[PDB]
Structure 1
Amino acid sequence: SHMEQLKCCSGILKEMFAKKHAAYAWPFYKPVDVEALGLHDYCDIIKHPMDMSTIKSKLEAREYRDAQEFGADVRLMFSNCYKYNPPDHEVVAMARKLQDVFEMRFAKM
């Protein structure tokens, strides 16, 4: 059942948004604000920006064919972060902590 699969995907995303993970998850809640952050090269380096709010909208709208399409967007959000930033960046360590939460829940769904 794909209704079942996406209920699980919604629960995973809702947990990623929960207070327990907020110390490291907050930079991923919304699209990267390139203008406010002065990252004028970001839209040239990152061809497909992704964030948790965009993913939530797609889940609500039922735009993912399966859990695999949901997973690929979550992993695109993390890969954009690892691609754009130096490996020692504070945001990369935050992306890794959030990805630890996602990979465990997603594998056990």
Structure 2
Amino acid sequence: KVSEQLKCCSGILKEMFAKKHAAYAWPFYKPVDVEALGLHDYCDIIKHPMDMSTIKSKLEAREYRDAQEFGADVRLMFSNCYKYNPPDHEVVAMARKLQDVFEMRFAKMP
């Protein structure tokens, strides 16, 4: 059922938070601290910021109708990173390693 795939989405997000991915996952745990980093143009270029904490809140508040809507937010998080940053930047390399974890689990969902 729809509520079985949303249970898997929780498991996928929990995995993305787990210790074994912590070295490359941490930049996506919470909203980009644009204040502290002095990224004055970030909110102008990124219209819909997204992060794993915001996704966790939305998932616990059952604001995702299906896995596809959860998926769109995970991919928005990564797209925001790929959009703002050059391809050589360390955060892009970290995004890709975490996205690979997401894409494999998301694809193998029953």
What TM-score do the two structures reach when normalised by structure 1?
0.97
Partner of 1:21: 21
Q: Distance in 2 between matches of 1:82 and 1:99?
A: 11
- How many Å apart are 1:32 and its aligned residue? 0.6
CA distance in 1 between partners of 2:6 and 2:66 (Å): 7
Q: Deviations over 1:52-105 (max 9, x none)?
A: 000000000000010000000000000000000011000000000000000000
Aligned to 2:97: 97
Aligned residue for 2:58, secondary structure, equals helix
- 1:65 maps to 65
* Contiguous gaps of at least 5 residues in structure 2: none
Question: What number of residue pairs does the alignment pair up?
Answer: 106
The alpha-carbon deviation at position 21 of structure 1 amounts to 0.3
Moved over 6 A (4+): none
Distance in 2, matches of 1:100 and 1:8, equals: 17
Q: Secondary structure at the match of 1:86?
A: coil
Deviation (angstroms), 1:19 = 0.1
Give the Cα separation in 2 of the matches to 1:30 and 1:39.
Answer: 16
1:10 Cα deviation after fit: 0.1
RMSD value, Cα: 0.3
